Protein backbone atom coordinates (compact mmCIF):
# COMPACT_ATOMS: atom_id res chain seq x y z
CA UNK A 1 0.00 0.00 0.00
CA UNK A 2 0.66 3.75 -0.59
CA UNK A 3 -0.20 7.06 0.75
CA UNK A 4 -0.70 9.91 -2.13
CA UNK A 5 1.85 12.20 -1.85
CA UNK A 6 0.09 16.62 -1.00
CA UNK A 7 0.60 18.35 -4.22
CA UNK A 8 -0.82 21.55 -5.58
CA UNK A 9 -3.00 21.05 -8.93
CA UNK A 10 -4.25 23.40 -11.74
CA UNK A 11 -7.22 22.10 -13.32
CA UNK A 12 -7.09 20.10 -16.29
CA UNK A 13 -4.13 18.16 -17.40
CA UNK A 14 -2.36 18.93 -14.55
CA UNK A 15 -2.26 15.29 -13.34
CA UNK A 16 -0.21 14.22 -16.48
CA UNK A 17 3.46 14.61 -16.83
CA UNK A 18 4.48 18.42 -17.89
CA UNK A 19 3.49 19.26 -21.48
CA UNK A 20 6.49 19.00 -23.62
CA UNK A 21 6.53 22.00 -26.69
CA UNK A 22 5.57 19.49 -29.12
CA UNK A 23 1.97 18.22 -26.83
CA UNK A 24 1.17 22.13 -26.57
CA UNK A 25 1.33 22.44 -30.26
CA UNK A 26 -0.87 19.69 -30.52
CA UNK A 27 -3.66 21.01 -28.09
CA UNK A 28 -3.23 24.54 -29.92
CA UNK A 29 -4.09 22.71 -33.46
CA UNK A 30 -7.40 21.08 -31.90
CA UNK A 31 -8.79 24.62 -30.74
CA UNK A 32 -8.10 25.93 -34.61
CA UNK A 33 -9.15 22.59 -36.50
CA UNK A 34 -12.62 23.13 -34.74
CA UNK A 35 -13.16 27.04 -35.35
CA UNK A 36 -12.18 28.54 -31.98
CA UNK A 37 -10.53 32.21 -30.89
CA UNK A 38 -7.45 31.59 -28.99
CA UNK A 39 -5.84 33.57 -26.22
CA UNK A 40 -3.09 33.77 -23.34
CA UNK A 41 -3.85 34.91 -19.80
CA UNK A 42 -1.74 35.79 -16.99
CA UNK A 43 -1.50 36.04 -13.52
CA UNK A 44 0.46 36.97 -10.15
CA UNK A 45 -0.80 34.34 -7.50
CA UNK A 46 -3.21 30.63 -8.79
CA UNK A 47 -6.04 30.56 -6.28
CA UNK A 48 -9.64 28.41 -6.38
CA UNK A 49 -11.47 32.01 -5.26
CA UNK A 50 -10.39 33.85 -8.22
CA UNK A 51 -11.79 33.98 -11.66
CA UNK A 52 -10.46 36.54 -13.47
CA UNK A 53 -6.39 36.49 -14.60
CA UNK A 54 -4.89 39.46 -16.71
CA UNK A 55 -5.71 39.26 -20.43
CA UNK A 56 -2.45 39.60 -22.69
CA UNK A 57 -3.44 42.26 -25.90
CA UNK A 58 -6.29 40.77 -27.06
CA UNK A 59 -7.82 37.61 -28.17
CA UNK A 60 -6.17 36.47 -31.52
CA UNK A 61 -8.92 36.74 -33.80
CA UNK A 62 -7.02 36.23 -36.90
CA UNK A 63 -4.82 33.11 -36.12
CA UNK A 64 -3.52 30.69 -39.24
CA UNK A 65 -1.24 28.91 -37.66
CA UNK A 66 -0.58 27.57 -34.24
CA UNK A 67 2.91 28.68 -34.77
CA UNK A 68 1.45 31.90 -34.29
CA UNK A 69 0.04 30.99 -30.87
CA UNK A 70 3.29 29.77 -29.51
CA UNK A 71 4.98 32.84 -30.25
CA UNK A 72 2.43 35.27 -27.90
CA UNK A 73 3.48 32.66 -25.33
CA UNK A 74 6.94 33.23 -25.39
CA UNK A 75 6.69 36.82 -25.63
CA UNK A 76 4.32 36.91 -22.31
CA UNK A 77 7.04 34.15 -20.63
CA UNK A 78 10.28 36.30 -21.13
CA UNK A 79 8.27 39.48 -20.00
CA UNK A 80 6.48 38.19 -17.13
CA UNK A 81 9.36 35.17 -15.76
CA UNK A 82 7.51 34.91 -12.06
CA UNK A 83 3.50 34.86 -13.64
CA UNK A 84 1.29 32.06 -14.37
CA UNK A 85 0.58 31.44 -18.00
CA UNK A 86 -2.43 29.85 -19.38
CA UNK A 87 -4.05 29.29 -23.04
CA UNK A 88 -7.26 29.82 -23.57
CA UNK A 89 -10.11 29.08 -26.30
CA UNK A 90 -13.31 31.09 -26.75
CA UNK A 91 -16.72 29.62 -28.47
CA UNK A 92 -18.66 32.45 -30.30
CA UNK A 93 -21.50 29.67 -30.64
CA UNK A 94 -22.21 28.73 -27.36
CA UNK A 95 -20.91 31.75 -25.78
CA UNK A 96 -18.31 29.43 -23.30
CA UNK A 97 -14.76 28.45 -22.78
CA UNK A 98 -14.34 24.95 -24.30
CA UNK A 99 -10.53 24.50 -23.57
CA UNK A 100 -8.08 26.19 -20.81
CA UNK A 101 -4.57 24.70 -19.36
CA UNK A 102 -1.61 26.37 -17.72
CA UNK A 103 1.78 26.26 -19.95
CA UNK A 104 3.82 27.91 -17.52
CA UNK A 105 4.27 28.39 -13.96
CA UNK A 106 6.67 30.74 -11.70
CA UNK A 107 10.34 29.62 -12.07
CA UNK A 108 12.00 29.57 -9.11
CA UNK B 1 -45.77 -3.47 52.72
CA UNK B 2 -46.60 -4.72 48.98
CA UNK B 3 -45.52 -4.05 45.43
CA UNK B 4 -48.46 -3.33 42.85
CA UNK B 5 -48.17 -3.86 39.21
CA UNK B 6 -50.30 -1.79 36.61
CA UNK B 7 -50.98 -2.18 32.94
CA UNK B 8 -52.21 1.03 30.99
CA UNK B 9 -52.71 1.03 27.08
CA UNK B 10 -51.07 3.04 25.20
CA UNK B 11 -53.76 5.18 23.44
CA UNK B 12 -54.88 7.23 26.57
CA UNK B 13 -51.19 9.13 26.72
CA UNK B 14 -50.29 12.03 23.97
CA UNK B 15 -47.40 11.24 21.66
CA UNK B 16 -44.21 12.85 22.65
CA UNK B 17 -45.15 14.38 26.15
CA UNK B 18 -43.85 13.69 29.61
CA UNK B 19 -46.41 16.42 30.71
CA UNK B 20 -49.04 14.31 30.19
CA UNK B 21 -47.64 10.85 31.54
CA UNK B 22 -47.03 12.37 34.89
CA UNK B 23 -49.88 13.86 34.81
CA UNK B 24 -51.79 10.78 34.34
CA UNK B 25 -50.45 8.07 36.51
CA UNK B 26 -48.58 10.46 39.73
CA UNK B 27 -51.57 12.86 39.46
CA UNK B 28 -53.96 12.48 42.74
CA UNK B 29 -53.58 8.65 43.42
CA UNK B 30 -51.09 10.14 45.96
CA UNK B 31 -53.25 12.32 49.07
CA UNK B 32 -55.81 9.26 49.11
CA UNK B 33 -57.47 8.68 52.52
CA UNK B 34 -57.35 4.78 52.20
CA UNK B 35 -53.51 4.96 52.31
CA UNK B 36 -50.82 6.16 54.66
CA UNK B 37 -47.88 5.79 51.97
CA UNK B 38 -47.27 5.64 48.25
CA UNK B 39 -44.03 5.70 46.51
CA UNK B 40 -43.45 4.82 42.54
CA UNK B 41 -40.31 2.63 42.16
CA UNK B 42 -40.47 2.20 38.49
CA UNK B 43 -41.90 2.96 35.07
CA UNK B 44 -41.43 0.59 31.52
CA UNK B 45 -41.56 2.81 28.44
CA UNK B 46 -42.91 0.79 25.31
CA UNK B 47 -40.95 1.14 22.09
CA UNK B 48 -43.96 2.76 19.92
CA UNK B 49 -44.33 5.32 22.24
CA UNK B 50 -40.30 5.82 22.96
CA UNK B 51 -40.51 6.75 19.46
CA UNK B 52 -42.37 9.84 19.47
CA UNK B 53 -40.06 11.49 21.47
CA UNK B 54 -37.25 13.64 20.51
CA UNK B 55 -34.45 12.32 23.26
CA UNK B 56 -31.13 13.86 23.86
CA UNK B 57 -30.43 16.82 21.21
CA UNK B 58 -27.17 15.18 20.43
CA UNK B 59 -25.98 12.45 23.04
CA UNK B 60 -22.59 10.40 23.91
CA UNK B 61 -21.28 9.89 20.69
CA UNK B 62 -21.98 13.22 18.21
CA UNK B 63 -20.74 14.98 21.51
CA UNK B 64 -17.15 13.90 21.41
CA UNK B 65 -17.00 14.09 17.82
CA UNK B 66 -18.12 17.79 17.84
CA UNK B 67 -15.26 18.35 21.35
CA UNK B 68 -12.63 16.43 19.95
CA UNK B 69 -12.00 15.13 22.97
CA UNK B 70 -12.13 10.79 23.07
CA UNK B 71 -10.11 8.25 25.95
CA UNK B 72 -10.54 9.82 29.33
CA UNK B 73 -13.43 11.31 31.36
CA UNK B 74 -14.16 15.22 31.07
CA UNK B 75 -13.06 17.38 34.00
CA UNK B 76 -15.26 20.29 35.03
CA UNK B 77 -15.37 23.32 37.72
CA UNK B 78 -17.71 25.42 39.40
CA UNK B 79 -16.78 28.77 40.57
CA UNK B 80 -16.99 29.47 44.18
CA UNK B 81 -18.61 31.75 46.14
CA UNK B 82 -22.43 31.22 44.72
CA UNK B 83 -23.37 34.37 45.35
CA UNK B 84 -21.00 37.97 45.51
CA UNK B 85 -18.59 38.41 42.56
CA UNK B 86 -18.78 40.98 39.60
CA UNK B 87 -19.19 39.61 36.48
CA UNK B 88 -15.16 41.10 35.62
CA UNK B 89 -14.42 38.85 38.69
CA UNK B 90 -16.18 35.92 37.94
CA UNK B 91 -14.54 35.90 34.13
CA UNK B 92 -10.93 35.98 36.16
CA UNK B 93 -11.73 33.19 37.72
CA UNK B 94 -13.56 31.47 34.70
CA UNK B 95 -10.08 32.30 32.59
CA UNK C 1 3.25 29.83 45.91
CA UNK C 2 4.43 29.65 41.70
CA UNK C 3 2.76 30.73 38.86
CA UNK C 4 1.81 28.27 36.17
CA UNK C 5 3.86 28.72 32.70
CA UNK C 6 2.27 29.28 29.58
CA UNK C 7 2.28 25.66 27.81
CA UNK C 8 1.03 24.64 24.36
CA UNK C 9 -1.45 20.83 25.16
CA UNK C 10 -2.52 18.09 22.83
CA UNK C 11 -5.83 16.64 24.03
CA UNK C 12 -5.36 12.77 25.85
CA UNK C 13 -1.95 12.39 27.61
CA UNK C 14 -0.35 15.51 27.01
CA UNK C 15 0.60 16.41 30.81
CA UNK C 16 2.52 13.05 30.95
CA UNK C 17 6.06 13.17 30.31
CA UNK C 18 7.15 12.63 26.60
CA UNK C 19 6.23 8.69 25.77
CA UNK C 20 8.79 6.33 25.90
CA UNK C 21 8.49 3.61 22.91
CA UNK C 22 7.90 0.57 24.98
CA UNK C 23 4.46 2.86 26.73
CA UNK C 24 3.20 3.36 23.17
CA UNK C 25 3.43 -0.39 22.64
CA UNK C 26 1.33 -1.11 26.01
CA UNK C 27 -1.12 1.60 24.99
CA UNK C 28 -1.42 0.14 21.54
CA UNK C 29 -1.84 -3.43 23.21
CA UNK C 30 -5.30 -2.14 24.91
CA UNK C 31 -6.83 -1.23 22.10
CA UNK C 32 -6.01 -4.80 20.45
CA UNK C 33 -7.33 -6.51 23.80
CA UNK C 34 -10.71 -4.80 23.66
CA UNK C 35 -10.87 -5.43 19.69
CA UNK C 36 -10.74 -2.43 18.34
CA UNK C 37 -8.95 -1.32 15.29
CA UNK C 38 -5.75 0.92 15.27
CA UNK C 39 -4.15 3.29 12.59
CA UNK C 40 -2.02 6.54 12.30
CA UNK C 41 -3.26 9.91 11.49
CA UNK C 42 -0.35 12.80 10.69
CA UNK C 43 -1.02 16.77 10.21
CA UNK C 44 1.06 19.32 9.48
CA UNK C 45 -0.35 21.83 11.93
CA UNK C 46 -2.50 21.02 15.28
CA UNK C 47 -5.07 23.32 15.93
CA UNK C 48 -8.69 23.23 18.06
CA UNK C 49 -10.50 24.34 15.16
CA UNK C 50 -9.44 21.47 12.85
CA UNK C 51 -10.85 18.12 13.64
CA UNK C 52 -9.46 16.13 10.22
CA UNK C 53 -6.26 14.83 10.05
CA UNK C 54 -4.51 13.30 6.96
CA UNK C 55 -4.92 9.05 7.32
CA UNK C 56 -1.34 7.10 6.63
CA UNK C 57 -2.69 4.57 4.34
CA UNK C 58 -5.51 2.28 5.55
CA UNK C 59 -6.67 1.40 9.18
CA UNK C 60 -5.00 -1.75 9.89
CA UNK C 61 -8.20 -4.35 10.06
CA UNK C 62 -5.86 -7.04 10.40
CA UNK C 63 -3.26 -6.67 13.55
CA UNK C 64 -1.76 -9.75 15.40
CA UNK C 65 0.83 -8.00 17.11
CA UNK C 66 1.33 -4.53 18.81
CA UNK C 67 5.03 -4.22 16.73
CA UNK C 68 3.33 -3.98 13.46
CA UNK C 69 1.47 -0.80 14.02
CA UNK C 70 5.42 0.68 15.66
CA UNK C 71 6.38 -0.19 12.37
CA UNK C 72 3.75 1.67 10.70
CA UNK C 73 4.47 4.49 13.10
CA UNK C 74 8.28 4.61 12.19
CA UNK C 75 7.46 4.51 8.55
CA UNK C 76 5.77 7.60 8.75
CA UNK C 77 7.71 9.46 11.39
CA UNK C 78 10.44 8.61 9.05
CA UNK C 79 8.77 10.32 5.78
CA UNK C 80 7.45 13.20 7.59
CA UNK C 81 9.98 14.70 10.79
CA UNK C 82 8.19 17.62 10.70
CA UNK C 83 4.66 16.76 11.20
CA UNK C 84 2.71 15.46 13.77
CA UNK C 85 1.84 12.19 14.33
CA UNK C 86 -0.75 10.44 16.60
CA UNK C 87 -2.21 7.11 16.85
CA UNK C 88 -6.56 6.49 16.78
CA UNK C 89 -8.69 3.31 17.48
CA UNK C 90 -11.78 3.04 16.25
CA UNK C 91 -14.67 1.09 17.32
CA UNK C 92 -17.24 -0.84 15.58
CA UNK C 93 -20.24 -1.35 17.54
CA UNK C 94 -20.12 1.52 19.20
CA UNK C 95 -19.03 3.73 15.97
CA UNK C 96 -16.97 6.10 18.33
CA UNK C 97 -13.26 6.93 18.77
CA UNK C 98 -11.84 4.98 22.05
CA UNK C 99 -8.39 6.44 22.51
CA UNK C 100 -6.16 8.56 20.31
CA UNK C 101 -2.84 10.07 21.88
CA UNK C 102 -0.10 12.00 19.97
CA UNK C 103 3.42 10.11 19.27
CA UNK C 104 5.47 12.91 17.07
CA UNK C 105 6.25 16.18 17.52
CA UNK C 106 7.75 18.58 14.48
CA UNK C 107 11.31 17.79 15.31
CA UNK C 108 12.49 21.86 15.81
CA UNK D 1 2.30 76.41 16.31
CA UNK D 2 3.94 72.26 16.38
CA UNK D 3 1.71 68.79 15.48
CA UNK D 4 1.47 66.36 17.82
CA UNK D 5 4.21 63.19 17.19
CA UNK D 6 2.19 59.93 17.13
CA UNK D 7 2.83 57.67 20.16
CA UNK D 8 1.64 54.80 21.56
CA UNK D 9 0.15 55.01 25.21
CA UNK D 10 -0.77 52.56 28.09
CA UNK D 11 -4.23 54.31 29.96
CA UNK D 12 -3.54 56.18 33.21
CA UNK D 13 -0.48 57.81 33.99
CA UNK D 14 0.86 57.17 30.70
CA UNK D 15 1.52 61.02 29.52
CA UNK D 16 3.55 61.54 32.28
CA UNK D 17 7.47 61.33 32.14
CA UNK D 18 8.55 57.64 33.14
CA UNK D 19 7.44 56.97 36.97
CA UNK D 20 11.12 56.70 39.27
CA UNK D 21 10.88 53.78 41.98
CA UNK D 22 9.96 56.77 44.59
CA UNK D 23 7.03 57.71 42.25
CA UNK D 24 5.93 53.78 42.33
CA UNK D 25 6.82 53.56 45.81
CA UNK D 26 4.34 56.37 46.97
CA UNK D 27 1.33 55.26 44.70
CA UNK D 28 1.53 51.62 46.35
CA UNK D 29 1.58 53.45 49.33
CA UNK D 30 -1.75 55.38 48.55
CA UNK D 31 -3.17 51.43 47.26
CA UNK D 32 -2.42 50.09 50.99
CA UNK D 33 -3.55 53.94 52.84
CA UNK D 34 -7.34 53.24 51.26
CA UNK D 35 -6.94 49.44 51.91
CA UNK D 36 -7.63 47.47 48.97
CA UNK D 37 -6.10 44.39 47.89
CA UNK D 38 -2.49 44.84 45.68
CA UNK D 39 -2.06 42.19 42.88
CA UNK D 40 0.33 42.09 39.58
CA UNK D 41 -0.72 41.23 36.40
CA UNK D 42 1.17 40.40 33.13
CA UNK D 43 0.96 40.11 29.91
CA UNK D 44 2.89 39.41 25.87
CA UNK D 45 0.95 42.11 23.74
CA UNK D 46 -0.85 45.56 24.70
CA UNK D 47 -4.03 45.74 23.07
CA UNK D 48 -7.09 47.84 23.80
CA UNK D 49 -9.30 44.60 23.00
CA UNK D 50 -8.03 42.30 25.28
CA UNK D 51 -8.87 43.09 28.96
CA UNK D 52 -7.83 40.26 30.80
CA UNK D 53 -3.99 40.06 31.98
CA UNK D 54 -2.49 36.94 33.74
CA UNK D 55 -2.42 37.08 37.20
CA UNK D 56 1.11 36.78 38.93
CA UNK D 57 0.84 34.08 41.85
CA UNK D 58 -2.13 35.42 43.85
CA UNK D 59 -3.37 38.47 45.17
CA UNK D 60 -1.69 40.05 48.12
CA UNK D 61 -4.05 39.56 50.86
CA UNK D 62 -1.61 40.30 53.44
CA UNK D 63 0.51 42.90 52.56
CA UNK D 64 1.73 45.20 55.62
CA UNK D 65 4.11 47.73 53.81
CA UNK D 66 4.85 48.75 50.10
CA UNK D 67 8.11 46.84 49.87
CA UNK D 68 6.59 43.48 49.77
CA UNK D 69 4.86 44.55 46.32
CA UNK D 70 7.89 46.26 44.90
CA UNK D 71 9.37 42.87 45.86
CA UNK D 72 6.73 40.86 43.68
CA UNK D 73 7.04 43.53 40.65
CA UNK D 74 10.85 42.59 40.85
CA UNK D 75 10.66 38.85 41.01
CA UNK D 76 7.64 39.15 37.76
CA UNK D 77 10.24 41.53 36.12
CA UNK D 78 13.12 38.77 36.23
CA UNK D 79 11.43 36.51 34.94
CA UNK D 80 9.55 37.87 32.40
CA UNK D 81 11.85 40.68 30.89
CA UNK D 82 10.15 41.23 27.61
CA UNK D 83 6.22 41.25 28.74
CA UNK D 84 4.45 44.14 30.08
CA UNK D 85 3.57 44.21 33.79
CA UNK D 86 0.85 46.20 35.53
CA UNK D 87 0.19 46.66 39.18
CA UNK D 88 -4.22 46.48 40.45
CA UNK D 89 -6.25 47.57 43.09
CA UNK D 90 -9.07 45.34 44.23
CA UNK D 91 -12.32 46.67 46.49
CA UNK D 92 -13.83 44.08 48.25
CA UNK D 93 -17.13 46.58 49.66
CA UNK D 94 -17.50 48.20 46.13
CA UNK D 95 -16.91 45.25 44.26
CA UNK D 96 -14.34 47.33 41.22
CA UNK D 97 -10.68 47.80 40.71
CA UNK D 98 -9.79 51.47 42.02
CA UNK D 99 -6.41 51.87 40.38
CA UNK D 100 -4.69 50.18 37.75
CA UNK D 101 -0.91 51.59 36.50
CA UNK D 102 1.70 50.07 34.11
CA UNK D 103 5.24 49.47 36.05
CA UNK D 104 7.18 47.63 33.05
CA UNK D 105 7.72 47.77 29.72
CA UNK D 106 9.45 45.03 26.87
CA UNK D 107 12.86 45.79 27.48
CA UNK D 108 14.56 46.27 23.29
Same mark, same amino acid.
Given at each position: ?5 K =?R @?? %?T ?7 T?VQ? =????? #? ?10 ? +?? =? &? ?6 ? $? /?? $????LFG?? /?? @?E??? =????? !???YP???I?? &? ?10 ? *? +?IV??? *?? | ?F?? #? ?6 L +?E?? *? ?5 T????N??G +? ?5 ? !????? @? ?6 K ?5 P????? %?R????? #?????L ?11 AK???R?? #?
Amino acid at each position: MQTLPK =ER @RY %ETLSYLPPLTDVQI =EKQVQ #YILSQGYIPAVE +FN =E &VSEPTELY $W /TL $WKLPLFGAK /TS @REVLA =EVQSC !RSQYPGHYIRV &VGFDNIKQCQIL *S +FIVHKP *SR | QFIA #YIAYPLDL +FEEG *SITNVLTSIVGNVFG +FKALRAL !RLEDI @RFPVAYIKTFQGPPHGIQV %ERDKLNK #YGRPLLGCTIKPKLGLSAKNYGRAV #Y
